[PDB]
Amino acid sequence: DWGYDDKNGPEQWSKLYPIANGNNQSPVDIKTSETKHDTSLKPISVSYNPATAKEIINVGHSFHVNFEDNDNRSVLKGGPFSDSYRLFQFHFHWGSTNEHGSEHTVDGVKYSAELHVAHWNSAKYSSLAEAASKADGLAVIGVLMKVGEANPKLQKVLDALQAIKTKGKRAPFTNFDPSTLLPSSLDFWTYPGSLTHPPLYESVTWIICKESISVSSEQLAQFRSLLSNVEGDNAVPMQHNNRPTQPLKGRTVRASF
Ligand SMILES: CCNC(=O)Nc1ccc(S(N)(=O)=O)cc1
């Protein structure tokens, strides 16, 4: 239905999802001269159990790496949160060339891709489906990915893609701790926002890392070689899946640093 093509993409999502033009939409451009340092922000604490890794899925516009979320084996705490948030997925966004592909920008600078590590509030809610539409329901860590040296931490993820080439394919994806993908510094920006694609719920507290991680030109190429079609149809590579930045509408981006 929705996608990233000219007909079904970001500038058209508002026709079926009017919250696309809301006051808490993501991503945003982080202007560093407008951020406010908040003394009350605690360090980010991630503690993930590799045994929670479950499955990798070609979802047509992207691929998702899902985690078992029946208990608190894998949690995010700290930062702006009083509640524990339970890991459920990570995924990436990328663009059609190295020049763009991140969702968030910093001082107008576009990176080549972005990693999202997503969690839901298990202190207040009983399931992702309950949490996903609540203002305090989701927490996503975003990592900007700067084109440069090959990142060996991506190897297991990239090696898995050949088994999920076309839409709907899925495979087991086990024994992996995604905190290995995060940068050395967890210094961060935070702001209240949204899912960056439909259904665009304004339910996400964003944690954007100040430090980038690397990716090579060829690693990006592997993401863009995934196919959005189902097996047996004409091949339609997944060339891009990044939303443009959206107006802050008077929100404050807080800095931990
Ligand atoms: C509500 C269903 N969302 C889901 O399964 N994964 C998801 C999709 C998008 C985002 S995002 N791009 O981090 O806003 C975070 C998580």
Ligand SMILES: [Zn+2]
């Ligand atoms: Zn995302």
